[PDB]
Design an enzyme around this catalytic site. Structure first.
Site, PDB file in Angstrom:
ATOM      1  N   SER A 192     -44.652  -1.475  18.853  1.00 40.89           N
ATOM      2  CA  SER A 192     -43.594  -0.502  18.645  1.00 40.89           C
ATOM      3  C   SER A 192     -44.176   0.900  18.733  1.00 40.89           C
ATOM      4  CB  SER A 192     -42.909  -0.707  17.290  1.00 40.89           C
ATOM      5  OG  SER A 192     -43.737  -0.259  16.231  1.00 40.89           O
ATOM      6  N   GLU A 222     -53.103  -5.341   8.455  1.00 42.90           N
ATOM      7  CA  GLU A 222     -52.582  -5.849   7.193  1.00 42.90           C
ATOM      8  C   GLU A 222     -52.522  -7.366   7.177  1.00 42.90           C
ATOM      9  OE1 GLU A 222     -52.975  -3.523   5.267  1.00 42.90           O
ATOM     10  OE2 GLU A 222     -52.594  -2.032   6.782  1.00 42.90           O
ATOM     11  N   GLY A 224     -47.790   3.166  12.959  1.00 45.65           N
ATOM     12  CA  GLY A 224     -49.161   3.620  13.084  1.00 45.65           C
ATOM     13  C   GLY A 224     -50.073   2.679  13.842  1.00 45.65           C
ATOM     14  N   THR A 225     -50.025   1.385  13.510  1.00 44.04           N
ATOM     15  CA  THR A 225     -50.869   0.417  14.206  1.00 44.04           C
ATOM     16  C   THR A 225     -50.431   0.245  15.653  1.00 44.04           C
ATOM     17  OG1 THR A 225     -49.548  -1.525  13.623  1.00 44.04           O
ATOM     18  CG2 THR A 225     -51.154  -0.748  12.007  1.00 44.04           C
ATOM     19  N   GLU A 266     -45.530  -9.903  42.180  1.00 42.29           N
ATOM     20  CA  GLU A 266     -44.588  -9.629  43.259  1.00 42.29           C
ATOM     21  C   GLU A 266     -43.599  -8.538  42.870  1.00 42.29           C
ATOM     22  OE1 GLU A 266     -42.830 -13.344  44.302  1.00 42.29           O
ATOM     23  OE2 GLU A 266     -44.171 -13.703  46.003  1.00 42.29           O
TER      24      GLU A 266
HETATM   25  N1  LIG Z   1     -37.582  -6.180  15.654  1.00 42.35           N
HETATM   26  C1  LIG Z   1     -38.271  -5.774  14.591  1.00 42.35           C
HETATM   27  N2  LIG Z   1     -38.670  -4.456  14.487  1.00 42.35           N
HETATM   28  C2  LIG Z   1     -39.367  -4.035  13.404  1.00 42.35           C
HETATM   29  C3  LIG Z   1     -39.681  -4.921  12.385  1.00 42.35           C
HETATM   30  N3  LIG Z   1     -40.370  -4.247  11.440  1.00 42.35           N
HETATM   31  C4  LIG Z   1     -40.502  -2.963  11.833  1.00 42.35           C
HETATM   32  N4  LIG Z   1     -39.879  -2.815  13.042  1.00 42.35           N
HETATM   33  C5  LIG Z   1     -39.803  -1.571  13.820  1.00 42.35           C
HETATM   34  O1  LIG Z   1     -41.073  -0.948  13.820  1.00 42.35           O
HETATM   35  C6  LIG Z   1     -40.901   0.452  13.845  1.00 42.35           C
HETATM   36  C7  LIG Z   1     -42.082   1.182  13.220  1.00 42.35           C
HETATM   37  O2  LIG Z   1     -43.278   0.444  13.329  1.00 42.35           O
HETATM   38  P1  LIG Z   1     -43.900  -0.192  11.991  1.00 42.35           P
HETATM   39  O3  LIG Z   1     -42.820  -0.894  11.215  1.00 42.35           O
HETATM   40  O4  LIG Z   1     -44.537   0.896  11.164  1.00 42.35           O
HETATM   41  O5  LIG Z   1     -44.995  -1.265  12.469  1.00 42.35           O
HETATM   42  P2  LIG Z   1     -46.438  -0.804  13.007  1.00 42.35           P
HETATM   43  O6  LIG Z   1     -46.313   0.049  14.243  1.00 42.35           O
HETATM   44  O7  LIG Z   1     -47.244  -2.032  13.314  1.00 42.35           O
HETATM   45  O8  LIG Z   1     -47.155  -0.029  11.792  1.00 42.35           O
HETATM   46  P3  LIG Z   1     -47.495  -0.780  10.410  1.00 42.35           P
HETATM   47  O9  LIG Z   1     -46.215  -1.231   9.754  1.00 42.35           O
HETATM   48  O10 LIG Z   1     -48.236   0.159   9.491  1.00 42.35           O
HETATM   49  O11 LIG Z   1     -48.363  -1.984  10.692  1.00 42.35           O
HETATM   50  C8  LIG Z   1     -39.613   0.715  13.086  1.00 42.35           C
HETATM   51  O12 LIG Z   1     -38.884   1.745  13.710  1.00 42.35           O
HETATM   52  C9  LIG Z   1     -38.847  -0.589  13.165  1.00 42.35           C
HETATM   53  O13 LIG Z   1     -37.689  -0.426  13.950  1.00 42.35           O
HETATM   54  C10 LIG Z   1     -39.284  -6.247  12.478  1.00 42.35           C
HETATM   55  O14 LIG Z   1     -39.557  -7.035  11.574  1.00 42.35           O
HETATM   56  N5  LIG Z   1     -38.575  -6.670  13.585  1.00 42.35           N
HETATM   57 MG   LIG Z   2     -47.469  -2.625   8.896  1.00 43.01          MG
END
Ligand SMILES: Nc1nc2c(ncn2[C@@H]2O[C@H](COP(=O)(O)OP(=O)(O)OP(=O)(O)O)[C@@H](O)[C@H]2O)c(=O)[nH]1
Ligand SMILES: [Mg+2]
Ligand SMILES: Nc1nc2c(ncn2[C@@H]2O[C@H](COP(=O)(O)OP(=O)(O)OP(=O)(O)O)[C@@H](O)[C@H]2O)c(=O)[nH]1
Ligand SMILES: Nc1nc2c(ncn2[C@@H]2O[C@H](COP(=O)(O)OP(=O)(O)O)[C@@H](O)[C@H]2O)c(=O)[nH]1
Ligand SMILES: Nc1nc2c(ncn2[C@@H]2O[C@H](COP(=O)(O)OP(=O)(O)O)[C@@H](O)[C@H]2O)c(=O)[nH]1
Ligand SMILES: [Mg+2]
Lengths: 426, 429, 66, 430, 426
Positions: free
Chosen positions: D131, D62, D135-136, D245
């Site tokens: 995370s 994105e 999905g990504t 280490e």
């Molecule tokens: N610390 C932090 N965690 C985030 C943020 N946005 C989303 N998350 C965490 O990301 C988890 C899920 O992943 P996504 O938000 O879908 O991000 P992604 O894995 O890259 O997938 P996409 O959003 O489609 O790109 C959620 O449970 C949130 O807790 C953020 O801005 N800061």
């Molecule tokens: Mg996203």
């Protein structure tokens, strides 16, 4: 300096050429008095191609203007740009042909071809280098097809290397303005094939479709009709007259546009056509121009390119643009539709770019095309001829001035040879 | 002293020259009007006025592209006797530029070349800018090669030619005029730099981060590579590469003399803001398949002889370090019978950028020439393109009508067949 | 007050349900991550002989590669 | 010389990376332009003009989190090539973002870590940020792990992943996304780091005086944690630890590599005006279970290995006192096989307070890594969550359409069942 | 980019879409002329999702307008923001539909669906990437439910892997506005269960009850109803256009919300709705926002979720937040209301927090629900169908178009089928 000698014949050709010289003088900034009053310096650098130098800064055009009845001359001369043509080019007669090919070709036509050749040869030999002849006439008429074909025959046996460039007006499908034009078209097509090297085909009702559905006009007169003809008239010699990064003359189109001597029938188009109601909603760039000149309802002929097959195609651009959009979308139109183009020719698109846009648009184009779909018109002319020769329907006003009856069979037998040759490549 | 003669033939050649001579004037002190406020000897003959005339011949059968030189901003630089104009165009026809209309003007341009070489005590070679898919650049130039190989003896002939792209194409008859010239210009040239058009469009789209540049931005890059070639004939360097050793390195055989072109540091202003360019990364980016100035896959082919022309602020130690990492890359397929395979040239003069240009001020510059075997793949592609046109008597009437026998067309096919079979023969173990 | 017609259209638009006032709302990380941006061990100040040893490490790595 | 390449896949990775790279540029003397008005070598690259390109690979499918960086205050800092964007979304699908639209762009991103590593004199390992829920960050991360394992190999892949929380959840298919993505962390990753949300929420609630914490306040803590572990490569000390280490000192098995990371003196400005975050009182605060960054109960498990990294004004003499006070306790219960289980790090530079944050700076900051067997009891609950949803094959039709067989959920279940017994069999011994 | 092509069919759909486009133009700062008026630079980097670029700093919509009566197109162009639309996208029928599903699908939709397909094929190729489609419906009439299903059945057949989030105004259970509504609604819902991935359910008396008993509007026109509907429309796609914490596009919502290939009948709402007099009497935060979202008197369907089970729930948030209140309250609501939510899914609520709020408020939410209370609204139309059809009442207005009497049996078969699959998880 590459010189074009213009001819007109008939009430078609006089009015179409009147609008052609109108838009050409408008482009070069030439007054009705003939004096230059334009702004840029680029309108004088190749002014000699269409105009002859005269004292008084007056540029007299290089064109012979001929029609048998002098009633059309009084309409041209009293027009907006009627005081710039020479009266020596105003050659005429006393009796109009009036919708008969044989009247204009043998009995009285022989009595004026000498008088018009004496001015064509006079203007042609006063030229530094001569490119060819550009003629405007009608196919379905009597003084265009009847007489101007004699001029092409007499030129081609005397200037055996100059290009032939004719802008004919073919009969319409569903509305007929004459009652005899199948005979005239059959008699003129047989004589235009073995002589001319580049023929254009225009029709009235398809241009009516253009100015109705596309231009959204309210009262389409003949003036806007002939202006739309003049747009593609000027756009074909726009690289022979103006500088650009990649220029093409008439011989470039001749060698890129014909595979064989008997396949040189063309059909024109004009790309940046939009109405007043959609002026502010159109993004004027390259992609909609290449998607619009490809459209079937932007063309100047009553033959759908869907039914035919494109052999080769030219596309002359105009204005200031980059060149990879141009070639990348020519690639797109050669690749999106492989069923539109012949597989036995590798590259089918010819492109050429000028620099100075037309007066009123930032970007413009001009479509030229050799299609097999033009076979659909000639088979219709031949079916009309066979429906009319089967009982000698109008034949006795043709053989009454010394025609052979058998020659009508030869005209059909050589006309359908073109249909047979187009059909082999489909 | 070592002065070279450049011949521009055709619309493409004239438009290339119009951008190359701009940077030729800009790199030295030569103003557009001809004045300067001995390194300029090799390109500009010095008259007694402080006004310098170029050593070039612009010739074209269509006058339309040459008049803009005569009325442009460089009207007071060129000798008016040089800019030869024709009467009638060749119009994409090889026969129109070879036999009838091209035959009239060859004696005038021959006399002009002779009178330009009369004022040249250090004649070294020819820099011909002719096109392949056009009318005069492919037909009129062949007569020039025919006259110069029998009149000026064994002199160096370096062609900077434009080849048709595999995908982007302009004319519809260009396979003909491309095939026709290779019959007699094969034996009448010593090296031929092949340049396409689409690959440079990828270069200015991908490496250059600007969209919709025009032909001027492509001719600027052609001027840059033609400047880096003759960098060692005008400026001091550690290892100057004269024009004669180019073909001592590059061409091994009397029928394989077709190298390739590559110019690595083609980054933009904002790229120069961030990334620093030393010798190693520009040498690596030079050997990238997608940085090439020809649409070809170099990994399919085998390099036979390459030469490097470094320009700017370089030291030799990391030049010799950077080529050793190319020896150990098995992804680059060098030929088994060229263990040295490299030539290095150094110049201390950094490359210059034109005002309003596309590139930025850089400190290091590398230009690559390499005899590969992917050019045989390009030639086989053009041969297959031409083979689906002679099957059914297509477009022949323009040729046999005007002073060209039909017996030429059968012989050129088998001559090119022998050429590609020889090219693939020498690429084997 | 140079954008008064926009607000006059928008409130007369949504005075039916959504009455309020015009503010400017920046994104959160354009308000958190912002132009707001003696030191023991300001760096491992390696110089001269250490640089020579680093170049040595590179050179005999490529040498034992050969 | 000692260099790390950061690949920040996914939106959470990009936001945490924005916080972490702001901290990194603040730690050294680098302006957001790139000019100072040998400690930057790990995370920057000196150019001729005085610019410094950070070594980060910001990849997402994105533009709305990448072009959102491009309009930020660090637009001139980052080289424009590494801000890789996409067209469409993985959209909470491991299968889609790993098989369908990840393929068209995974050949492009991999050409950027190659150029970053060509500029690397010596690379020590990667630091991935994603995370486990979305999905990504579940499909692209797996593709990156497999491609880097085939490509580079014998490096130290650090994995700073965000785990799904037991109670707080956003996606519905996030157990499906989290269970599937363990098939590259277990095999193709050499170290990993679970973090869930509610633990950071409670830390901000209780240790900090703040309520209503936005998501920048979480990424700042994560960035401080990651700056702590890589502090020794930039500033070593009396007892320096190294990235290759501590990997050997944190795993007993090639399969138990899931530690827990804490930053003990999280403290406020009104809170810390009264007490002294001394060496002796923050070490037993390292083992407080509600200061754990993963919401799990370490009383119900046994400590297996440990690694404590100090930072700032620490003397080695009371560290032995702190290590002697801990082992005598009854509740802090250890594995019988290893008696020591402790490796200690010392560094001399105090933390850098971010202007605009909440963490008022202390002088003795300790980062704590512990390998606990209690985290497996936080893994049977996720298995229960997947079991209660796979009973009638819900949400399956949006995975089997994208060129992947239905049975990979079941074989993932066999892998998780066979992974639980590894933690079962350890701990108990003769 | 991630851009949505809009379609408006029927009078109700056209009147709703003429409010949707015009509140969107409010949200992005576009005047009725088409240029830019906004106060921030944040309204233009994601303008290409809905709008197309036009030269001169002008902006045009991306929508096709289709009906069978020129009166609604006249009314659309007569509005305040009607002149921004392109006029060549206006393709319409010119004889009435009769409120016949058969005539609107077979005899009159068959003429028009070709030209609409041509225009949407022109417009879908004007973007580098197309995210999906958007359509406004009305499940009671004939000109908004006869060819719209024909539009969808020839969009899924040609663009097979995209998103069609059609919005439909469902017929009423208690009162009505057309006596043939059960027929058209069953015939439309037979085709909305097969080829559509996201559909919505809008009930006019829910709008009436919201605007009377909550908004306290004395005289509610239809404009306020379409304003509420368009406010629900704008919140779903806010993450496509505006940045935020936890973004979620339409594919995010699709993947999270509907579990099965058939259970995709949504249940939409808008949280911060209050009257004028009570705005200064309430605090504006997430704890009251989640209640006003979960309140059934802020709902657009007359079916109590107390009588059914909530399957999955979405909540697209807007404005400045702090997501502890967002995360912890979707736990609290599920903990207190344990019986209503299903048991086989652990977390039933997805949140998506954006940052840029709508104009007027800072605390805005879009309720999206999937409940088993849909079957209690669908029995009330299956019973009306089984009352009308058994007496053999109204079929010759459908039998006269080539469709026979047995086709209605598959519609009610699929009706009882759907009711059965809703009852499996109650
Ligand atoms: N610390 C932090 N965690 C985030 C943020 N946005 C989303 N998350 C965490 O990301 C988890 C899920 O992943 P996504 O938000 O879908 O991000 P992604 O894995 O890259 O997938 P996409 O959003 O489609 O790109 C959620 O449970 C949130 O807790 C953020 O801005 N800061
Ligand atoms: Mg996203
Ligand atoms: N790279 C590049 N190619 C050019 C340029 N100008 C023309 N060309 C190429 O030239 C080809 C056709 O033009 P020419 O070869 O010059 O035609 P010609 O040799 O002049 O023959 P005539 O025009 O009939 O006189 C096209 O395919 C272009 O790719 C230029 O400025 N740069
Ligand atoms: N476009 C156009 N067509 C014309 C014009 N004048 C006549 N025609 C066409 O000419 C055809 C009749 O042929 P005509 O001109 O009478 O032939 P002529 O009498 O031999 O010159 C009709 O189909 C008309 O469409 C004109 O000014 N413009
Ligand atoms: N929200 C809204 N609904 C409308 C409007 N006009 C008509 N309707 C609804 O349309 C339904 C009747 O269907 P109709 O629009 O005549 O179907 P069509 O003729 O096929 O477009 C009624 O139940 C109305 O509630 C309007 O302006 N706004
Ligand atoms: Mg030329």
């Amino acid at each position: 300096m590459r010189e074009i000698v213009h001819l007109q014949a008939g009430q078609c050709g006089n009015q179409i050429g009147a609008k052609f010289w109108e838009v050409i003088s408008d482009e070069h900034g030439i007054d009705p008095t003939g004096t230059y009053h334009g702004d840029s310096d680029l309108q004088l650098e190749r002014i000699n191609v269409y105009y002859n130098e005269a004292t008084g800064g007056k540029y007299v055009p290089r064109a012979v203007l001929v029609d048998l009845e002098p009633g059309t001359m009084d309409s041209v001369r009293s027009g907006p740009f009627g005081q710039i043509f020479r009266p020596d080019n105003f050659v005429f007669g006393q009796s109009g042909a009036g919708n008969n090919w044989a009247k204009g070709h043998y009995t009285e036509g022989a009595e004026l071809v000498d008088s018009v050749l004496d001015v064509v040869r006079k203007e042609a030999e006063s030229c530094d280098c001569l490119q060819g002849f550009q003629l405007t006439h009608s196919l379905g008429g009597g003084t265009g097809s009847g007489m101007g074909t004699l001029l092409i025959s007499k030129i081609r046996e005397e200037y055996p290397d100059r290009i032939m460039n004719t802008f004919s007006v073919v009969p319409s499908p569903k509305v007929s303005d004459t009652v005899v034009e199948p005979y005239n078209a059959t008699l003129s097509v047989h004589q235009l094939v073995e002589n001319t090297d580049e023929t254009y085909c225009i029709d009235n009702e398809a241009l009516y479709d253009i100015c109705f559905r596309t231009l959204k006009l309210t009262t389409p007169t003949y003036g806007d009709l002939n202006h739309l003809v003049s747009a593609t008239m000027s756009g074909v010699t726009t690289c022979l007259r103006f500088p650009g990064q990649l220029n093409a003359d008439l011989r470039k189109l001749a060698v890129n546009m014909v595979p064989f001597p008997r396949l040189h029938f063309f059909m024109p188009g004009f790309a940046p056509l939009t109405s007043r109601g959609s002026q502010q909603y159109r993004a004027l760039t390259v992609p909609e121009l290449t998607q619009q000149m490809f459209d079937a309802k932007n063309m100047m002929a009553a033959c759908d390119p869907r039914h035919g097959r494109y052999l080769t195609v030219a596309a002359v651009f105009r204005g200031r643009m980059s060149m990879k959009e141009v070639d990348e979308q020519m690639l797109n139109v050669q690749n999106k539709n492989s069923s539109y183009f012949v597989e036995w020719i590798p590259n089918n698109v010819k492109t050429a770019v000028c620099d100075i846009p037309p007066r009123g648009l930032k970007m413009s184009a001009t479509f030229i095309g050799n299609s097999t779909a033009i076979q659909e018109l000639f088979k219709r002319i031949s079916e009309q001829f066979t429906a009319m020769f089967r009982r000698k329907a109008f034949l006795h006003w043709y053989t009454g001035e010394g025609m052979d009856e058998m020659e009508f069979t030869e005209a059909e037998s050589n006309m359908n040879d073109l249909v047979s040759e187009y059909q082999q490549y489909q | 002293m070592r002065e070279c003669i450049s011949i521009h033939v055709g619309q493409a050649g004239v438009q290339i020259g119009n951008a190359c001579w701009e940077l030729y004037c800009l790199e030295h002190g030569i103003q557009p009007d001809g004045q300067m406020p001995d390194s300029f000897n090799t390109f500009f003959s010095e008259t007694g006025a402080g006004k310098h005339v170029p050593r070039a011949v612009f010739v074209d059968l269509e006058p339309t592209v040459v008049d803009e030189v005569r009325t442009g901003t460089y009207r007071q630089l060129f000798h008016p006797e040089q800019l030869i104009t024709g009467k009638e165009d060749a119009a994409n026809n090889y026969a129109r530029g070879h036999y009838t209309i091209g035959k009239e003007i060859v004696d005038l341009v021959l006399d002009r070349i002779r009178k330009l070489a009369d004022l040249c005590t250090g004649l070294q070679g020819f820099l011909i800018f002719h096109s392949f898919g056009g009318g005069t650049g492919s037909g009129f130039a062949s007569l020039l090669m025919e006259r110069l190989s029998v009149d000026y003896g064994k002199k160096s002939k370096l062609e900077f030619a434009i080849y048709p792209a595999p995908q982007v194409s302009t004319a519809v008859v260009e396979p003909y005029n491309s095939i026709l010239t290779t019959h007699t210009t094969l034996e009448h040239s010593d090296c031929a730099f092949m340049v396409d058009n689409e690959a440079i469009y990828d270069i200015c789209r991908r490496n250059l981060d600007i969209e919709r540049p025009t032909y001027t931005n492509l001719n600027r890059l052609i001027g840059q590579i033609v400047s880096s070639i003759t960098a060692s004939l005008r400026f001091d360097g550690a290892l100057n590469v004269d024009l004669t050793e180019f073909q001592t390195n590059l061409v091994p055989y009397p029928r394989i003399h077709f190298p390739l072109a590559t110019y690595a540091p083609v980054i933009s202003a904002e790229k120069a803001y961030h990334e620093q360019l030393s010798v190693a990364e520009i040498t690596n980016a030079c050997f990238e398949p997608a940085n090439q100035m020809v649409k070809c896959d170099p990994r399919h082919g085998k390099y036979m002889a390459c030469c490097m022309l470094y320009r700017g602020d370089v030291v030799p130690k990391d030049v010799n370090a950077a080529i050793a990492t190319i020896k150990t890359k098995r992804t680059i397929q060098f030929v088994d019978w060229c263990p040295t395979g490299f030539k290095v040239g150094i110049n201390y003069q950094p490359p210059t950028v034109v005002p309003g240009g596309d590139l930025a001020k850089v400190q290091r510059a590398v230009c690559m020439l390499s005899n590969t075997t992917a050019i045989a793949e390009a030639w086989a592609r053009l041969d297959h393109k031409l083979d689906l046109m002679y099957a059914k008597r297509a477009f022949v009437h323009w040729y046999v009508g005007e002073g060209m026998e039909e017996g030429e067309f059968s012989e050129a096919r088998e001559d090119l067949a022998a050429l590609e079979k020889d090219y693939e023969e020498v690429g084997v173990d | 007050s140079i954008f008064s017609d926009y607000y006059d259209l928008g409130y007369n638009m949504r005075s039916n349900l959504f009455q309020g006032a015009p503010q400017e709302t920046k994104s959160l990380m354009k308000a958190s991550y912002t132009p707001e941006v003696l030191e023991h061990w300001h760096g491992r100040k390696t110089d001269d002989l250490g640089r020579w040893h680093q170049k040595n490490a590179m050179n005999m790595n490529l040498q034992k590669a050969l």
